[PDB]
Design a protein around this ligand. Structure first.
Ligand SMILES: CCCCCCCCCCCCCCCCCCCCCCCCCC(=O)N[C@@H](CO[C@H]1O[C@H](CNC(=O)Nc2cccc3ccccc23)[C@H](O)[C@H](O)[C@H]1O)[C@H](O)[C@H](O)CCCCCCCCCCCCCC
Ligand SMILES: *[C@@H]1O[C@H](CO[C@@H]2O[C@@H](C)[C@@H](O)[C@@H](O)[C@@H]2O)[C@@H](O[C@@H]2O[C@H](CO)[C@@H](O)[C@H](O)[C@H]2NC(C)=O)[C@H](O)[C@H]1NC(C)=O
Ligand SMILES: *[C@@H]1O[C@H](CO)[C@@H](O)[C@H](O)[C@H]1NC(C)=O
Ligand SMILES: *[C@@H]1O[C@H](CO)[C@@H](O)[C@H](O)[C@H]1NC(C)=O
Lengths: 266, 239, 96, 203
């Protein structure tokens, strides 16, 4: 299962100034980038066009180009409409895309956050507020739902274009999607012991402190941290009394190793 | 969905305050003011998304907007200038895309009111020779000596406005073309069946609504103050 | 309004005298306007690459800065962050 | 200026078809509306076109829209006198109130009335309240006749104008002359115009 996500971030500092920036992800790989500064969407992979022809892509990009300008003026008008209830600075985020399942199956979504809170989604044939949303949003919802052309376009994007596109991406990027990159580990301590694991792809990983045959209860896995080359980094810590270092090993299991675990004794 | 505008026609002086009102009973949230000048599409001046809200449109300079209630949207020209001479259109709408237009207000801002003058109106009665040759009767109405050209000529038979058989000059003519100050004339025709004109129970009236000064404009000349007024002439049919 | 978390770590195992890459991962902040510097002995490093800003499932923003560096016994490395949620810039030092 | 109309103006004879064009660069283009505006009057909506490739009609009016070409036409079949007006193309950039309207500057149509049975005459009309005051009415000429302005600053002549007696299905052209002199006559009134050979001058 892969999730494809188009993430749009828009800031509106006042009546005149705004910028919109987007990135696109397929699982944990970036496929597209669209900076406010740029007229065109950039591919961040050789396979980012998926199985679309040049004509189909140029057409699709053109529609997004117009959308970015339309979105910007629609927010600014929506603010004037709510005035003085809401004012600048405003932050809007959109998360749109689809999750692909085995076979012919998928689910699409279009979630909207206002000032960092999820308030609105497209669902079925219309926009709706989600539970916990403030009631003033009902006027913008009513206004957005008056726009039949937008509704038909969004239904087509979510129901057809998105899954079709992603299926093409999955075939074109198979090689990169299924890359295996080997971790490299190293050890240190602070006045607790640390097993550093870096360079691995994909994400699933197993890091445990061992004394011989026996796994240590106390091992504390840190968060997964990214590297710039699209591999992952993780640390596992273990607190011990000083003097008890001797005979502890760090053990790492990862798909890339072909079952030859990394084993590092202190 | 009904939208009204007042005044419908206004003569004003440079530096005067002019207010143009728009009323709608549609319970529409949204209201818009446009001006239309020759050679141009309608251009948006101010608009409003509800009571207490006003927003700048494309050409807001020299105008202020007021939205005191759901019903009323005013355009206020605090210091009228000749460049604000135009036809203004108000519109309203709900959340959908349709705007419902008012009928328009004609505004003329003059640099000076000194030559404003209401019309004389005369009604001329059908030629007996026309009656015998064609079996029709043509009445002619002349309005003369008026300034500026903001008049509405209309015909009334038995106290009801008639449109059929009527033709009014599209342009008023200049009485003394060599002159900047020149007064205007304007003719109109009403043509009926001879027997209609022959019926002595039919009262025919030519009416000219003149737009001029308001009761509150200052007037320094000896002649009567040339206020907005109706001047009219009248005759009964005869066998 | 939420405070940025900062995590500084090397791409490869740190060996004095050997070229490496230093990462500064800044997360959990909002609004997304932010200023990030990487420092060597308190001075700004010039060639600092920045990933695109993005955001997580909880709608909070994150960004990855990274730069070439050579660790030594004596040079200190840090990542300095300015964000509106903080009155003073926060500096997190590379440890090990 | 994102909405261009052509022609700027045209003159057609009653009964003839005509076609008006509208070309735009407004983006996005949700719908396109045509309005009719009579001289001195407001805007009457004729049709609105909303689809990628669209066609509409409304009596003797039909319209096409091609959004790929950003091009619309308004066809008027069998023009009538009442079609004389300015036709305005307007493009809405949203399917909601968030939209702005983009107005063309208009096309001016003039329709020449078909006068089938001309009976050209010059009549004298007297004032309802003064014996001594009169006007001269030149009437019932066909539309090939032009009315020329007077050769005297003291004499006034209006342009021709057409009236429609709807009850009778009857149209006639007329023009009016008068003068603040007393030694001025109807037979002399329209001398300055090329008036038809057989104009009726009753005495
Ligand atoms: C969706 C994910 C799947 C995509 C797979 C392809 C992957 C490629 C990767 C590259 C993408 C990188 C960018 C990522 C950014 C994330 C984007 C997700 C947003 C999807 C929403 C797109 C909405 C499309 C419709 C649109 O542009 N509609 C606009 C133009 O509309 C006009 O013009 C239209 C013609 N115009 C029209 O129909 N346009 C389009 C036509 C056909 C296809 C289009 C495709 C894209 C865009 C526009 C298209 C019609 O004629 C309409 O009737 C007319 O009105 C409207 O102005 C609309 O209101 C824009 C705003 C939509 C988002 C609203 C979010 C809710 C905000 C709540 C606010 C809170 C209150 C604040 C006070
Ligand atoms: C597109 O699909 C929807 C239903 O799918 C859901 O909403 C999508 C936008 C996407 O997020 C999916 O993964 C979701 O599962 C159709 O909506 C239904 O339409 C019928 C009749 O029109 C209506 O009676 C139902 O209530 C709708 N379903 C829901 C859940 O609201 C929609 O019609 C599809 N549109 C097109 C053009 O294919
Ligand atoms: C609006 O916001 C930007 C960004 O903060 C600022 O630089 C600009 O001066 C502002 N302009 C106005 C008119 O408020
Ligand atoms: C973002 O892009 C738009 C459209 O090109 C531009 O007009 C705007 O000024 C940009 N914003 C910033 C902050 O650079």
């Amino acid at each position: 299962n892969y999730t494809f996500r188009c993430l749009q971030m828009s800031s509106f500092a006042n009546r005149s100034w705004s910028r919109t920036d987007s990135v696109v992800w397929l699982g944990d790989l970036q496929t597209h980038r669209w900076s406010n500064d740029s007229a065109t969407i950039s591919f961040t992979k050789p396979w980012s066009q998926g199985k679309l022809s040049n004509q189909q892509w140029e057409k699709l990009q053109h529609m997004f180009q117009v959308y970015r300008v339309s979105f910007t003026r629609d927010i600014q008008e929506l603010v004037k409409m709510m005035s003085p209830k809401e004012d600048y600075p405003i932050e809007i985020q959109l998360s749109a895309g689809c999750e692909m399942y085995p076979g012919n199956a998928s689910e699409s979504f279009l979630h909207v956050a206002f000032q960092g809170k999820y308030v609105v989604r497209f669902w079925g044939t219309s926009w709706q507020t989600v539970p916990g949303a403030p009631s003033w949003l009902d006027l913008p919802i009513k206004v957005l739902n008056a726009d039949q052309g937008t509704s038909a376009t969004v239904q087509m994007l979510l129901n057809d274009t998105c899954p079709l596109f992603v299926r093409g991406l999955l075939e074109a990027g198979k090689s990169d999607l299924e890359k295996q990159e080997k971790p490299v580990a190293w050890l240190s301590s602070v006045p607790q012991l640390v097993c550093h694991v870096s360079g691995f792809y994909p994400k699933p990983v197993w890091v445990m402190w061992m004394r011989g045959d026996q796994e240590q209860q106390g091992t504390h896995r840190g968060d997964f941290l990214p590297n710039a080359d699209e591999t992952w980094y993780l640390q596992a810590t273990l607190d011990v009394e000083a003097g008890e270092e001797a005979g502890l090993a760090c053990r790492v299991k990862h798909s890339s190793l072909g079952g030859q675990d990394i084993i590092l004794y202190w | 969905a009904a939208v009204t505008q007042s005044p419908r026609n206004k003569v004003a002086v440079t530096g005067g305050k002019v207010t143009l009102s728009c009323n709608q009973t549609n319970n529409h949230n949204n209201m818009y003011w446009y001006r239309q000048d020759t050679g141009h599409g309608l251009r948006l001046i101010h608009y409003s998304y509800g009571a207490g809200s006003t927003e700048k449109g494309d050409i807001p300079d020299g105008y202020k907007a007021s939205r005191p209630s759901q019903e009323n949207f005013s355009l206020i020209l605090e210091l009228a200038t000749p460049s604000q001479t135009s036809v203004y259109f108000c519109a309203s709408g709900d959340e959908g895309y349709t705007q419902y237009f008012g009928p328009g207000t004609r505004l003329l801002v003059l640099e000076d009111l000194r030559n404003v003058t209401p019309p004389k109106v005369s009604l001329f009665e059908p030629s007996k020779a026309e009656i015998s040759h064609t079996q029709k009767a043509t009445l002619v109405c002349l309005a003369t000596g008026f300034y500026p050209d903001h008049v509405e000529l209309s015909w009334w038979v038995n106290g009801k406005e008639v449109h059929s058989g009527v033709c009014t000059d599209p342009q008023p003519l200049k009485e003394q073309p060599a002159l900047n100050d020149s007064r205007y004339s304007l003719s109109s025709r009403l043509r009926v069946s001879a027997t209609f004109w022959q019926n002595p129970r039919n009262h025919f009236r030519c009416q000219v609504q003149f737009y001029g000064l308001s009761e509150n404009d200052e007037w320094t000349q000896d002649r009567a103050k040339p206020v907005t007024q109706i001047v009219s002439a009248e005759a009964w049919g005869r066998a | 309004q939420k405070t940025p978390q900062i995590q500084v770590y090397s791409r490869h195992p740190p060996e004095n005298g050997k070229p490496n890459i230093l990462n500064c991962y800044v997360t959990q902040f909002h609004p997304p306007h932010i200023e990030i510097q990487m420092l060597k002995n308190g001075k700004k490093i010039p060639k600092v690459e920045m990933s695109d800003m993005s955001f997580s499932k909880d709608w909070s923003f994150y960004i990855l800065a990274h730069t070439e560096f050579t660790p030594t016994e004596t040079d200190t490395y840090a990542c300095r962050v300015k964000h509106a949620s903080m009155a003073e810039p926060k500096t997190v030092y590379w440890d090990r | 200026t994102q909405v261009e109309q052509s022609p700027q103006s045209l003159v057609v004879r009653q009964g003839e078809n005509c076609v008006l064009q509208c070309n735009y660069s407004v983006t996005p283009d949700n719908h396109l509306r045509w309005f009719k505006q009579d001289t001195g009057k407001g805007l009457v909506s004729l049709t609105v076109l909303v689809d990628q490739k669209d066609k509409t009609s409304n009596g003797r009016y039909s319209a096409t829209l091609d959004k790929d070409a950003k091009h619309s036409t308004l066809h008027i079949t069998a023009t009538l006198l009442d079609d004389t007006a300015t036709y305005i193309c307007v493009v809405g950039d949203r399917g909601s109130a968030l939209g702005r309207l983009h107005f063309g500057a208009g096309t001016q149509l003039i329709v020449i009335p078909d006068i089938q049975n001309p009976d050209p005459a010059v009549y004298q009309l007297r004032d309802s309240k003064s014996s001594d005051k009169s006007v001269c009415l030149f009437t019932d000429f066909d539309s090939q006749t032009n009315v020329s302005q007077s050769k005297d600053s003291d004499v006034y002549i209006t342009d021709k104008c057409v009236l429609d007696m709807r009850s009778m299905d009857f149209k006639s052209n007329s023009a009016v002359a008068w003068s603040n002199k007393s030694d001025f006559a109807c037979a002399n009134a329209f001398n300055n115009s090329i008036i038809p050979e057989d104009t009726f001058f009753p005495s």
